[PDB]
Point group: C5
């Protein structure tokens, strides 16, 4: 894309949406919504076959935007995004393991934190990379995973790529953003690991993230499509008998766009 | 919402509002023992028998302040705020009747664990979204708590049919209500959470920090019907009794707000 | 105080240096355990919470006399000293590099002695009048009568576990106001700046910095610093860096001294 | 001796690449790739001889830049000057996995231990090999279980601090151990390197990934690494922690790194 | 000193480059425990607190002679420093003979616990204040340690009668000497402490960071008698032996200091 000038009233527009988490029980009408199923643990690396619904996936959505030598496209300028329902973590009376010889608080949701989001003019481009090349994903055929398995995929093998084109379908554990592509998408992410680690979270409606690149060009919405993706894991819920489930929270986006002429 | 015009200049164009809010950890009566704490935390046997006891549930603190009464109108516009947690030094106390370190010879455990700190300033009540860790939580032990009368599975995620307004102090549980980011155009909120079991509280206090409430366009919260809305929650951790029983501990918050006159269409 | 212009000329600025030693409970520099509290005790119940004499940290404070400015106190204008900035440091942080003291030790009595560790509390204030204090405690019933030299309210009440504005005081005495029940009153202190932090937990690593290259500006949003009433400069602080854990597990607060280097200038005020 | 920039079309160029991790099992056709072999522990400091493949090494590559063909007999020459780099750790999301054959929490009912503990992250971009200084926690370490490792031929007590007679250049991928080689601060004028270490036993890994951060490689004089012989040197190590096996066996886990480097032509004195 | 104009033009700037090796207690580079302390011992009681020889960390320091320079005189003025801790990557080693995780199947304990990092650059020796956690500490197992000749209860606080200047490498214990903030007008110092028992070390290394040494008036340390003084300490934790015995580990530090010629009144 050769980028021409901005169109100088009716030349900007806002898009609001939220994405609900995809931890593994992704049916809103059922119990454990917004959690994974019970986490299971492989007996050996060649019997690493997770149960259905115990694997978190990326959340994603495509939004439709309004529709010579010169053409106009929607340019994404900025985004205010925030994690919703952080305060739901101020809860230590649920049916959980508890502190101090069954006299103290219930363990709050705690441990692993993974927070990512992305905004672009096309689906987020993915790279396959996993901790265990032999992971068998066939307990849930709705997951999108490569048809073949190889030793090299525990590192970066560029023959194993994909595009985030489906909500609740791409496991975060084997797909990450492809840094060699995504020239038309902006992505930001963090991971805090460990076993019982304190979640450290913020929420405010005053923070704006500029999506313009180093030349003042935001993501350009191809075929007038805006692509928004995320994942937000805030820890594990610890059951009374020590069984554990991922907990994730939803994400909100407020995206400002403008009109931009291209060649 | 409101079509904004020019600022009013000259004398009497500025005013100030100073207040504090007391914590609402669950025992909220200032003449009862345990004021500024929750009652003892209890733990449900299963997720369909999740009924907290009366008073073990932290709620939001909030107040509405009447401001001076004043083609076009004039409204009070909130410009900035100096806000601080009060009584941080009270947590330097290890001689209370608590569990203690090192084979009963060491210090009392200080108040420690979960920290949750939020405050909001707006020209109307804080707009809320329901979201909970357990859609079945039964709040009927305390009929003063404001919660939805219908329980649904989808409220463990974001369901936008479950909204509310923060219009009563000491009644909206923090655990099920958060700021609605899809509204709150006329309010600024700021919040954080540090979890874990016995996590160190990390706290700061000073009278030298000003939070600017002006938005990207240089427009602060505009005070509808001459009302200013201030809300907060400040959990600093848990007090651990001798037998392991635990109570939330909260601290008060101070606000000093600067407001100016703004002309609107 | 109605504030006017700065006074210029070669006598317009002055500098004040001092340090304040810690007041952890054992506050006599000729005695053992100086710079620590006495052994911490633990109440049997909340209505028998009576700390032992010397187990309680208090604020360090001092009033410094400044050069006299006004001989005639019947003029339309007067001059006051105005605190512009302060360079302050915690002294002796390197002392915490010590794992050979008589302490509990790691790894079945073969490892290091526990270093001083746990709760940290750091605050300092510079003002032109005493730091104004608000009473707030974790236990309204706390009985201070083991040490009648502590300054505390004469009445107790449930409401003091929150903010009761009828329970206030001024920091007018070194080593006497307990940290656990007095904090800076944010509804006053118009003429003092304070800065404070707390890091809790049981065995928490202390995290401390020391340098001679950082200046804290004390001017407010309008460019006005603390104005020294009666030509008096008030400096206050507390610096708790953790607990020393004795061989049997008894524990003491440890504190460190603080240094202050303050720049002041002359300012004209209405009289 | 640096002079001014040159103008015109093709005064600029970009180089894009990634480097895979070198934790010990460095063969992409075999199991445990991207991990070390199980860590083993010496019985005494005079018998400290690690097994082959349990030892992390630096990743590195020389990249050929478009050739600057020119008369070598004149007053000036032209060099490629690295201006800036966008670099990120790839696959961070792979650490969101608690179902692998690992030790697990809460009396064998909870999650599998995620990859956790020691984190070591460095990258370097230069116009010649990264210059290395030898420094080890044990001077007696015996690397002779793997003769591919590049280490000094003699051992001396002084190598537990800085002995400047023990230096190297980082000229082979997967060969220079991290544990005994660090960047030499007394040289490397023509390289920029960045590093960090978070230690401890089971420490939460803290990681970020984005495509929006540029690292300026120009020094305080506005001069970037200058690529000798039209060669660009890129180096890294990204240890994200240990995998804990069911029985307590532990392996390093590392992750690949991406680089996108901007370079411009600069005139230098000949 | 009354500072006047800078000296301009050629040979008005110079650079100084050095490193300082750590002084953790075993400070003899030909011996096996170099760059560590001897094993830490723990006193039976505070009145019997006599550390063994070699288990005490001390400051590293050096004086560098600058080129001969000289109503008015010329002095060297330190403008900035680039400094880094060297050999951080050496802490990526969990196969040494040490205590280990998970019932003797897991990693060796890495070097961990207490971190203390400080450096100083000035035009005269760094001025010290005595302050200790235990006034009775008996240092006579090593009479090469420079400590006060007299002891008193008040030295667990700040007693300004107990001062020194950092004039010897590997001799002033870190546990009882700190920078004196009432002096050091002609030195810049920077330090941090992270304590705890087994705390993760958090360390950074880079050749791209410059520390400006000029004060608020644009004046850096002025090198009296053409002497530049550099001091540091870099403790990175403890090595835990198989039986639980522990020793301090330190790392060396590099400095690259830029100086300029400054005219001053005499």
């Amino acid at each position: 894309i050769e980028v021409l000038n901005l169109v100088t009233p009716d030349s900007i527009t806002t898009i609001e949406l939220y994405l609900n988490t995809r931890m593994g029980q992704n049916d809103e009408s059922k119990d454990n919504y917004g959690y994974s199923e019970k986490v299971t643990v492989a007996n050996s690396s060649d019997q690493d076959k997770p149960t259905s619904g115990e694997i978190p996936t990326y959340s994603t959505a495509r939004i439709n935007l309004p529709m010579c030598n010169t053409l106009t496209m929607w340019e994404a300028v900025s985004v205010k995004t925030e994690v919703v329902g952080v305060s739901s973590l101020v809860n230590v009376h649920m049916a959980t393991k508890r502190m101090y010889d069954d006299k103290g608080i219930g363990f709050p949701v705690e441990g692993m934190n993974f927070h990512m989001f992305a905004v672009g003019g096309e689906p987020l481009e993915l790279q396959f990379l996993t901790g265990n090349y032999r992971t068998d994903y066939s307990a849930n055929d709705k997951l999108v995973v490569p048809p073949i398995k190889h030793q090299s995929t525990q590192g970066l093998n560029p023959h194993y790529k994909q595009k985030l084109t489906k909500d609740g379908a791409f496991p975060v554990e084997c797909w990450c953003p492809d840094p060699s592509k995504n020239e038309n998408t902006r992505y930001y992410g963090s991971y805090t690991g460990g076993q019982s680690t304190p979640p450290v979270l913020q929420f405010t409606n005053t923070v704006t993230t500029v999506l313009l690149d180093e030349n003042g060009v935001g993501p350009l919405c191809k075929g007038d499509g805006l692509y928004v993706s995320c994942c937000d894991i805030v820890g594990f819920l610890v059951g009374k008998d020590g069984d554990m489930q991922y907990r994730g929270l939803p994400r909100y986006f407020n995206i400002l766009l403008r009109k931009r002429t291209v060649r």
